Design a binder for this molecule. Structure first.
Ligand SMILES: *[C@@H]1O[C@H](CO)[C@@H](O[C@@H]2O[C@H](CO)[C@@H](O)[C@H](O)[C@H]2NC(C)=O)[C@H](O)[C@H]1NC(C)=O
Ligand SMILES: [Ca+2]
Ligand SMILES: [Ca+2]
Length: 275
């Protein structure tokens, strides 16, 4: 269990975005050439256990605990009728008060806000990645592919990510081996050595959200200087093509920095290795 290990992501130039946006409302277009300096990125989503080390040390009280509620998928018991705001739903109690994390220590932490994530990473001698670092990393050395691994969803007939199978929201067949979340080290790594960069839990980035992008070539871009929503990436175990096709590197979405929910977590990046 090296669930806080990092990988060196190589310096390089890449196509961020796409001239074939499958969800236009989200600012997937235009494709634009971005240059990214070499850095490090968590190989894994931050796990319940890793977060607990953080909380052991600092006594950090997450925002869901402070507000007293968080968003849980009805399916496992508001932005959709299936998102319910549940009292005493937080990272220790992912589906509300009578749920627990004891049987799932290696699964990614949930019900953490952008602030929670930042407190963790900075605690950890790290920081959140920018969207561009995230997306570049997601792509995993490949150019203009849908997914970290290519354009087939199940290559060689194999599940490569934790998402929805079946009729959403009513039936999740769990064909891919998991109905909710999966251990942070489940499924194959992309070419850069990252696990579950699409699927499992959504992932916070450091950028404010905008849908307005130039084709101006940029270098280590931080997104806009302001916003009201922060950028999240890579879909979750609830994604399906039929209604939410965001288990692609190009896809993107947003939340206010103080939101939290049962399919949303994070991982850290860093310019240089921490201790
Ligand atoms: C966070 O702190 C708690 C409490 O100090 C740790 O749990 C204890 O660990 C010791 C040593 O393994 C055991 O003898 C006890 O059985 C535990 N006590 C309790 C209160 O359950 C816990 O391991 C820490 N969590 C993490 C992720 O490091
Ligand atoms: Ca699944
Ligand atoms: Ca993920």
């Amino acid at each position: 269990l090296a669930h806080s290990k990092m990988v060196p992501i190589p310096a390089g130039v890449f196509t961020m975005g796409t001239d074939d946006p499958q969800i236009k409302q989200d600012g997937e277009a235009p494709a634009r050439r971005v240059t990214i300096d070499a850095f490090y990125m968590d190989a894994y989503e931050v796990s319940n256990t890793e977060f607990e080390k953080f909380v052991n040390s600092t006594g950090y009280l997450t925002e869901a605990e402070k507000f007293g509620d968080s968003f849980v998928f009805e399916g496992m018991l508001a932005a959709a009728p299936w998102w319910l705001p549940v009292k005493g739903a937080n990272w220790r109690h992912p589906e509300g008060p009578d749920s627990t994390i004891l049987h799932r220590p290696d699964h990614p932490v949930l019900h953490v806000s952008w602030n929670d994530a930042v407190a963790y990473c900075t605690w950890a001698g790290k920081r959140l990645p920018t969207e561009a670092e995230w997306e570049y990393s997601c792509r995993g050395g490949l150019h203009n592919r849908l997914f970290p691994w290519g354009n087939k969803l199940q290559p060689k007939g194999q599940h490569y990510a934790n998402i929805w199978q079946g009729e959403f929201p009513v039936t999740n067949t769990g064909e891919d081996g998991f109905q909710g979340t999966a251990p942070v080290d489940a499924f194959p790594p992309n070419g850069y050595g990252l696990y579950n960069i699409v699927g499992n839990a959504w992932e916070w980035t450091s950028d404010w959200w905008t849908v307005h992008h130039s084709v101006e070539e940029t270098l280590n871009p931080k997104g806009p200087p302001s916003g009201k929503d922060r950028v999240k990436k890579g879909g979750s175990y609830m994604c399906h093509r039929s209604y939410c096709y965001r288990y692609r590197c190009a896809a993107r979405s947003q939340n206010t920095p103080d939101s939290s929910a049962s399919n949303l977590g994070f991982r850290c990046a860093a310019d240089r290795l921490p201790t």
